[PDB]
Amino acid sequence: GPSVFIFPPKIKDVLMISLSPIVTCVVVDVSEDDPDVQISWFVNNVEVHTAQTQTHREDYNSTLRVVSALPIQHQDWMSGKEFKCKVNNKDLPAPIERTISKPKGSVRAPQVYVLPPPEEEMTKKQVTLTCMVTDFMPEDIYVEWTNNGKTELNYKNTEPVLDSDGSYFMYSKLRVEKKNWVERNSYSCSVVHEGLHNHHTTKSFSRS
């Protein structure tokens, strides 16, 4: 029966010195008859014993789901270490292993632009600011908005798109009260990407 998926940490948890990047193995289709699952973790084939393995959550299908989260070192992800989880369970005719690492690839920092609202919107209750982030490799990226350091609630990012020169782009949209976009006020799109000096850039503007 059971199946295993492995997931990378968030690029922002890796780049930001104070955050904690985690690699995750998820075992699904664990039968309720045979709930016990043993999960072993390895970094460059060196076994480690630090994973939080969460009380095998229950699922609809009437199956169990096992989530094991290995906290890792920032340096280990970016240096290309291999993270491997090994999964044992009675119903497995033999252990399942999954491996993941950060792939080599070119690194290209994104260009970041903020676009003001379109003209016709200028007379609506809310307006919409757009952050356009283009030209970046690899595709892992984090984008958010603020206004004088207060991080904004109401923005949504698209997922990245493989552009035609093989780089990635994405857009981030922020809805704000028209009132704001006029009087004083500052809005900033912050982007975190490994190609950017000190990992981050923010682009700003307001009322023209």
Binding site: Q73, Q75, M78, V107, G149, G195, N198
Partner: protein, 180 residues
Amino acid sequence: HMVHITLDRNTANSWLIISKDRRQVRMGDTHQNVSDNKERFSNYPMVLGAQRFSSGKMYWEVDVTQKEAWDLGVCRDSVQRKGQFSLSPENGFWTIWLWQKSYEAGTSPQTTLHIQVPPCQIGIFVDYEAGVVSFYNITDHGSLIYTFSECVFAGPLRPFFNVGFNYSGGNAAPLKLCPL
């Protein structure tokens, strides 16, 4: 106009390892067990010099041998320490840097530097009264790299250093304040 710079431990990102003579600094692999305070740069491997200048001409040298990333320059005493920020004269920093095989001046947006001979040591020159910060390539007979002019220092200045992250493994080498 050489001046003897030492590092101010209290300003150092808590992951930096500063020698006893406070003349060298390297990025450590672990949080370093120094107490938090408001002066200490939180998000980046940066540190200030202990010295503070408000007038005159000051010059110092920094060894960057084998390093793949760093920022160097001067900056206002009153610059931001916590959270995310960019190095630019608006924010109180006059710096240059090496990042991913390019040399840039910390203008906004940043300015591409044209350096023929990659430097192993850099000289930083501040002339407070003239409103000038200049950078010099010591490996290349002291040739000019970059000159910020009409600077608005707006207060006391401090020597500024970024050792660089070393998530890659290629940037463990330290910054050294050079044998005067």
